Design a protein around this nucleic acid. Structure first.
Length: 325
RNA sequence: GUUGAAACAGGGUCAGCUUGCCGUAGGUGGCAUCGCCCUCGUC
């Protein structure tokens, strides 16, 4: 019920068309976006910030999920088309060089192998020729709003070609097929079972996705980061027999329902309330809407479900709210 | 005699130094306890 209802309501919201991920995506906050042309050439440094009273790291966009970078070897992960601010320009504020060059090398190798595996796609040619030209990265630093990017941590630099201004580099009708195929091939050749919230196949998932919304840094939810929490010596993996698909689903659900209108700060904690729809409670979701307008009534439609409440800690997440009635 | 085990609230924090409830003031200017009665009628 803790993770089964998560996948249930995620699959329910997926068939209702409400801006949710679909096999290999996640709504992540992107501050400054580097808009370029069709064949490289840095054009502009757009920024979509200015939200509430606190200047967040831009607006949420659907980008392919990652495998986590928390650790000593944060350069061997090699993300797809988006990562940290130092994964493209190879420049860091407090970390310096050395480790920043290996990250850029891994990023350019990944985009080169992606262009080789999928040629003639326009969007991949720009991101493949921009990281290998070794001439526009210096002009990117000498822009207009570049001084406001190295002042905050966790900056994300994304790419976007011209002739669109509405479709990102990872949302064109070319990379979505590869993203859907990678989740049905790379994450389906590990083990055979047994799953948990589904009961079917679903191989054993390793290294859960980092959930961002309660800590200052993205941290995983259910992931044994040590060794004294495993079952019979599983070494981070077989301790929680959860499939990769269900893990991705519940992690994306928790990441999406922690920044939208369902996100509210109770008190040193960021929880989320939602119903089973078949939500629209209009009583708990509007915690800080205005001045608590008269909305509680009896519309003979009291849904069931429960109220999941996650809280930060020292490295993982703690579940405190648990009440079905 | 083959199965949740191995799990600390934490080492420590004087809530203090300062503050007269006080300088501030007539319970008073004023009112006959009295106009009235055989302690005796007596052998």
């Amino acid at each position: 019920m803790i993770l089964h209802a998560l996948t249930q309501y995620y699959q329910r919201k997926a068939e209702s068309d409400g801006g949710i991920a679909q096999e290999g995506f996640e709504n992540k906050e992107i501050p400054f976006i580097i808009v370029i042309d069709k064949q490289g050439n840095f054009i502009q440094l757009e920024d979509t910030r200015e939200l509430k009273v606190k200047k967040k790291v831009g607006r949420t966009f659907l980008v392919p999920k990652g495998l986590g970078r928390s650790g000593s070897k944060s350069y061997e992960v090699s993300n797809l088309l988006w990562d940290h601010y130092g994964y493209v320009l190879a420049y860091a504020g407090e970390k310096g060089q050395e480790q920043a060059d290996k990250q850029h090398a891994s990023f350019t190798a990944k985009v080169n192998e992606l262009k080789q595996a999928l040629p003639d796609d326009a969007g991949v040619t720009a991101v493949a020729a921009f990281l290998s030209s070794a001439e526009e990265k210096s002009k990117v630093m000498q822009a207009a709003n570049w001084a406001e990017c190295a002042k905050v941590k966790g900056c994300n630099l994304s790419f976007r070609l011209v002739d669109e201004a509405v479709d990102l580099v990872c949302q064109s009708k070319a990379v979505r097929e590869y993203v859907s195929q990678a989740n049905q091939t790379q994450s389906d050749n590990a083990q055979k079972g047994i799953c948990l919230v589904t009961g079917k196949a679903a191989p054993i998932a390793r290294l859960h996705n980092a959930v961002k919304g309660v800590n200052a840094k993205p941290a995983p939810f259910a992931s044994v980061n040590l060794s004294a929490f495993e079952s019979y010596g599983k070494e981070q993996g077989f301790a929680f027999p959860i499939g990769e698909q269900a893990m991705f689903e519940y992690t994306t659900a928790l990441n999406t329902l922690l920044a939208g209108e369902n996100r509210f700060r109770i008190g040193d904690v960021t929880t989320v309330c939602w119903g089973a729809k078949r939500a629209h409670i209009d009583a708990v979701k509007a915690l800080y809407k205005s001045l608590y307008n008269g909305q509680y009534c009896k519309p003979d439609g009291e849904d069931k479900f429960y109220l999941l409440g996650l809280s930060p800690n020292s490295a993982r997440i703690v579940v405190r709210f648990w009440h079905e009635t």
